[PDB]
Amino acid sequence: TPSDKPVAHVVANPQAEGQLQWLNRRANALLANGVELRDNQLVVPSEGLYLIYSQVLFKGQGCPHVLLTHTISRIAVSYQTKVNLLSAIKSPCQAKPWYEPIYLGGVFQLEKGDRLSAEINRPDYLDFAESGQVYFGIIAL
Amino acid sequence: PSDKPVAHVVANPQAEGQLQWLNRRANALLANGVELRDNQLVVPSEGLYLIYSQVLFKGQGCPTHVLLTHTISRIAVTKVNLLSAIKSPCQRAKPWYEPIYLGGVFQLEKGDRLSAEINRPDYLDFAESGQVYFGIIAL
Amino acid sequence: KPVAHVVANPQAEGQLQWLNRNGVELRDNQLVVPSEGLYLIYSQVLFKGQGCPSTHVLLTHTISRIAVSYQTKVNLLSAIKSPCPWYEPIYLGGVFQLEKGDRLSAEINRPDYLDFAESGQVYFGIIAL
Ligand SMILES: CC(C)(O)c1ncc(-c2ccc3nc4n(c3n2)[C@@H]2CN(C4)C(=O)c3cccc(OC(F)F)c32)cn1
Numbered sequence: 001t002p003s004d005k006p007v008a009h010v011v012a013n014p015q016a017e018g019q020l021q022w023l024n025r026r027a028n029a030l031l032a033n034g035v036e037l038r039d040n041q042l043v044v045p046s047e048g049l050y051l052i053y054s055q056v057l058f059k060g061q062g063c064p065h066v067l068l069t070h071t072i073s074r075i076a077v078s079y080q081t082k083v084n085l086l087s088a089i090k091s092p093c094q095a096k097p098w099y100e101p102i103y104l105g106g107v108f109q110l111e112k113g114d115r116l117s118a119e120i121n122r123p124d125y126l127d128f129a130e131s132g133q134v135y136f137g138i139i140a141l
Numbered sequence: 142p143s144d145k146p147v148a149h150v151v152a153n154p155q156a157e158g159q160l161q162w163l164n165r166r167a168n169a170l171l172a173n174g175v176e177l178r179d180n181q182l183v184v185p186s187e188g189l190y191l192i193y194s195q196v197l198f199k200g201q202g203c204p205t206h207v208l209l210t211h212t213i214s215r216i217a218v219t220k221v222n223l224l225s226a227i228k229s230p231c232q233r234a235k236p237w238y239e240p241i242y243l244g245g246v247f248q249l250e251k252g253d254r255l256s257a258e259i260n261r262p263d264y265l266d267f268a269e270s271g272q273v274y275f276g277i278i279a280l
Numbered sequence: 281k282p283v284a285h286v287v288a289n290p291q292a293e294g295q296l297q298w299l300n301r302n303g304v305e306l307r308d309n310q311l312v313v314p315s316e317g318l319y320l321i322y323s324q325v326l327f328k329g330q331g332c333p334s335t336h337v338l339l340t341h342t343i344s345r346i347a348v349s350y351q352t353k354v355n356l357l358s359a360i361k362s363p364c365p366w367y368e369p370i371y372l373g374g375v376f377q378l379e380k381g382d383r384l385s386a387e388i389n390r391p392d393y394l395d396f397a398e399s400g401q402v403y404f405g406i407i408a409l
């Protein structure tokens with residue numbers, strides 16, 4: 001049986017300077033059943049409950065103060081500003097290399113035309129030495 | 142359309158001296174039988190559930206052996222500790238930030254009450270939305 | 281709609297071995313996909329230690345896919361943590377389209393640091409959507 005559930009799982013472009021850019025045209029990544037990726041945002045095709053998730057991986061070669069943030073935001077139709085749905089702050093430095101993963105997840109009622117963004121404050125600290133470390137997705141329940 | 146019991150409640154940024162959960166806010170929900178009664182999530186049916194919660198603490202400098210705790214408890218129709226974490230933000234102004242994330246899968250029974258509590262609500266950070274939450278997902 | 285929730289065997293210490301109790305099979309420490317379709321794959325592992333050593337400790341947790349039509353191993357989700365008593369949990373989860381016969385594995389690099397006391401914190405599963 002073929003599912004018609006709006007789903008997305010986009011991955012970060014490891015070659016995008018000073019930014020966390022989401023791609024669907026990669027192995028084990030997808031945009032299906034109405035979900036679109038427009039201006040680095042996931043656009044919701046229909047109203048309903050959705051599971052929203054994102055993971056980023058930060059890495060630094062040592063400690064030089066550094067604040068790392070990762071946020072999933074929602075912009076509703078006819079609105080312009082992002083309202084935080086999920087957000088986390090980490091302080092990796094309280095020269096050995098440090099690693100800081102941030103995982104955000106939750107269930108949210110979304111409306112048709114909503115735009116979701118998964119953003120960070122310090123893309124200079126993003127790590128891409130391996131696949132599956134930086135991602136963002138939604139699944140209609 | 143799924144009939145899986147789900148919940149995602151957020152802290153009241155105005156409720157001083159407490160970590161009070163709200164479902165009647167934008168981007169917060171109680172669906173498929175889950176209820177929020179007496180600051181607790183009430184389980185509608187038996188089964189495996191993913192339980193999660195994040196709280197963010199922030200202080201304006203370390204003058205002091207401050208202990209920060211975050212716990213998720215279960216009360217059955219028997220009180221058990223499900224998830225717990227302790228953090229010591231003070232090694233020794235210079236602001237500090239301390240997030241505590243708790244997550245896990247637990248077998249819950251119908252009528253179970255889940256609570257997500259902290260010991261220092263005076264250190265809770267509310268300068269931004271989406272930082273303090275409590276949720277459950279039936280599997 | 282098949283589901284699978286498997287937990288770490290606390291008696292097979294020194295290796296992250298999975299224990300089962302829907303129709304998703306557990307063969308050779310891997311979850312085997314029964315049919316073509318979409319799936320949420322999640323997991324959690326818990327690490328702990330009594331202190332820090334000279335050699336820099338790196339903790340990793342990865343969920344891989346061995347596609348049946350090509351037989352190679354590709355990361356689906358991965359995370360690294362540098363804990364330097366300490367406790368370090370690692371979470372993963374995402375929706376992937378998978379084919380019949382695909383094998384999923386959830387592995388770590390330091391089983392000597394695994395925490396077997398927490399069953400509700402060392403697990404691996406899938407749910408067909
Ligand atoms: C509704 C639906 C699709 O059927 C479903 N959603 C989620 C799960 C599930 C069960 C156990 C899990 N343990 C973990 N997860 C699980 N997901 C991940 C990662 N990590 C560990 C978390 O602590 C976590 C926190 C918040 C959401 C989150 O899910 C993420 F996909 F959005 C996670 C099962 N079923």
